[PDB]
Amino acid sequence: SFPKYKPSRLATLPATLDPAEYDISPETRKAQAERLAIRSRLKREYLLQYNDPNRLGVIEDPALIRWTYARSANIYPNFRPTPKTSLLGALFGIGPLFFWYYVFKTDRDKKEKLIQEGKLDQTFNISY
Template sequence: MADYREAPLAARPKTLDPNEYFNLSPEYRRSEEDRAALRANLKRQYQMQLNNPHRKELIVDPALNRWVYARTNPYPHSDHRHPPSVCLYYVFKTDRVRDVLQLVLIVLTSYKMVLVAHVK
């Protein structure tokens, strides 16, 4: 820590700031100890489940579940991507249907003219 020189364009890391590193309030230390105890308890529970020789069910690891979900769903809340494709589908579909209907009308009118000419 004594050999550390600050970079001209970078801030000092919080862990190297003596005011933040040594002068911690008692409530901050207590909260860090509580978080460390909670992490240790969760780790102990997971290790107990993992090393249980009579285990018959799968081990539920919330962190692993979150990781798998994040890996399989890289774009959460990405519903904004779908409306343009739906709109384009609607435009192309209605345009195609309109063209087909016009073609059918043209064919029917020409067929009607042929029938009328054939009858006369």
């Protein structure tokens, strides 16, 4: 009984240690065959175009076009102001700005106070 491997988000569970890889059913095997069918059809189309002696240029992959569109164009059309979206947007957009305002304003005010009280050393600070 060696210690078990706790999978995490940055440490995925090894297939060998997958509890489902050892409980297989007829439906699962059928699904695996269907997935291989999909892959084989896609690879056939790709290789047919890739080995074509007449083809000159890129083999436009619809998947790449879809990925780029989904990552750029489709975002706003499929966005709805929601409690999560609104709160996260508020926090991550305006929150940091006010934190940095607090920090810089406090530092600058302290510096100005010290300068006014003549209690800051700028003996050789002659290049601002």
